Amino acid sequence: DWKDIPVPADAGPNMKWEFQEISDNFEYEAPADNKGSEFLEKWDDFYHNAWAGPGLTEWKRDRSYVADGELKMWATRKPGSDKINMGCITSKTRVVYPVYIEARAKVMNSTLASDVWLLSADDTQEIDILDAYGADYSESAGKDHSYFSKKVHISHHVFIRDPFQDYQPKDAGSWFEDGTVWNKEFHRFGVYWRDPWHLEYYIDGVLVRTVSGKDIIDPKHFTNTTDPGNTEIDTRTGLNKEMDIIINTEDQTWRSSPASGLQSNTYTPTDNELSNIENNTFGVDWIRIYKPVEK
């Protein structure tokens, strides 16, 4: 039973993990174009503001649904356009540290991203739980895609909004790989967001990466309360803001319109590849959320 699977993160001395009722195991039916009350108690079937998404992404309410025990989301070409319509949902309640969140999900066999992530209301602070490009092969690039099919990107971002600037860690351990081809099975991807300076990432019940301390979480002081980006003064908040849970797929600009301008680094679904619905359907069996409490 999903609620009983041990939590791999450590609740602390004389502490236990308490299951949060905002968790969802998606056992109800929610039609794509008419979600119903069970879905809508916990989720909104869009991004958290009117933006339709990055790259070729054009999010749609009717590209997410719940059926046969899973949250599902799929992708179709927008008629007359290069854009791809695909799903995005947002939690109606926010979470904050200390909190352990884990999704059991199956990365798509697509060049599109399969995402489970956390984002503050003001778009300044973000934590990835799952961010993966699962395809075995890319027709757009004409190449074996196993460089990506074997990697999951585990990261966090802090932003300055105007003018827009984005920091994330970029060391090699931010892409996890152990030989697993992610698109073949459901796996459990979790994060313990312990405090503003400490994240632990877990895959299948095992600690795979720790990101801890000011020098990796915010070395450019984008989180200063006074004068973001000024490293001479330190009023950094860290990852302190409460966050929405977002589940989606995305086409990103660095993939569909790469810097190099080269077809060979261009990874985005062709019309032929979009004809396979299953390959472009992202499935989430459940998402469970726990808080540490005193015994």
Ligand X SMILES: OC[C@H]1O[C@@H](O)[C@H](O)[C@@H](O[C@@H]2O[C@H]3CO[C@@H]([C@@H]2O)[C@@H]3O[C@@H]2O[C@H](CO)[C@H](O)[C@H](O[C@@H]3O[C@H]4CO[C@@H]([C@@H]3O)[C@@H]4O[C@@H]3O[C@H](CO)[C@H](O)[C@H](O[C@@H]4O[C@H]5CO[C@@H]([C@@H]4O)[C@@H]5O[C@@H]4O[C@H](CO)[C@H](O)[C@H](O[C@@H]5O[C@H]6CO[C@@H]([C@@H]5O)[C@@H]6O)[C@H]4O)[C@H]3O)[C@H]2O)[C@H]1O
Nearer residue to Na ion within complex by CB, 17 or 28: 28
Binding mask 270-289 for Na ion (x = CB under 5 A): ---------------xx---
Contact stretch for Na ion (CB under 5 A) within 61-69, 135-143, 254-262, 264-272: 61-69
Please state, in angstroms and rounded to a whole number, the distance separating the CA atoms of residues 229 and 239: 15
Please state, in angstroms and rounded to a whole number, the distance separating the CA atoms of residues 243 and 18: 19
Rounded to a whole number of angstroms, the minimum distance from the CB of residue 253 to ligand X is: 9
Work out whether 240 is an interface residue with Na ion (CB under 5 A).
no
Nearer residue to ligand X within complex by CB, 72 or 255: 255
DSSP assignment letter at 256 = H
Please state, in angstroms and rounded to a whole number, the distance separating the CA atoms of residues 239 and 169: 14
User: How is the chain split among helix, strand and coil, in percent rounded to 5?
Assistant: 15, 40, 45
Rounded to a whole number of angstroms, the minimum distance from the CB of residue 284 to Na ion is: 8
Work out whether 159 is an interface residue with Na ion (CB under 5 A).
no
Q: Find which of Na ion, ligand X, none residue 85 binds, CB within 5 to 8 Å per kind.
A: none
Please state, in angstroms and rounded to a whole number, the distance separating the CA atoms of residues 86 and 281: 9
Binding site for ligand X (CB under 6 A): 49-51, 54, 113, 115, 117, 119, 123, 126, 128, 131, 147, 153, 155, 157, 159, 175, 250, 252, 254
Q: Please state the separation of Cα 78 from the chain's center in Å.
A: 23
Taken in order 64, 68, 71, 76, the sign of the CA dihedral is: negative
By CB under 5 A, the residues from 65 to 94 that bind Na ion are 69
DSSP assignment letter at 19 = E
Q: Find which of ligand X, Na ion, none residue 44 binds, CB within 5 to 8 Å per kind.
A: none
Nearer residue to ligand X within complex by CB, 53 or 292: 53
Q: Find which of Na ion, ligand X, none residue 251 binds, CB within 5 to 8 Å per kind.
A: none
Among 23, 25, 240, 253, binds Na ion (CB under 5 A): 25
Please state, in angstroms and rounded to a whole number, the distance separating the CA atoms of residues 204 and 6: 11
Nearer residue to Na ion within complex by CB, 69 or 98: 69
Work out whether 23 is an interface residue with Na ion (CB under 5 A).
no
- The amino acid occupying position 236 is R
Work out whether 26 is an interface residue with Na ion (CB under 5 A).
yes
Please state, in angstroms and rounded to a whole number, the distance separating the CA atoms of residues 11 and 7: 9
Q: Are 48 and 88 in contact (CB under 8 A)?
A: no
Which chain residues interact with Na ion by CB under 5 A? 25-26, 69, 285-286
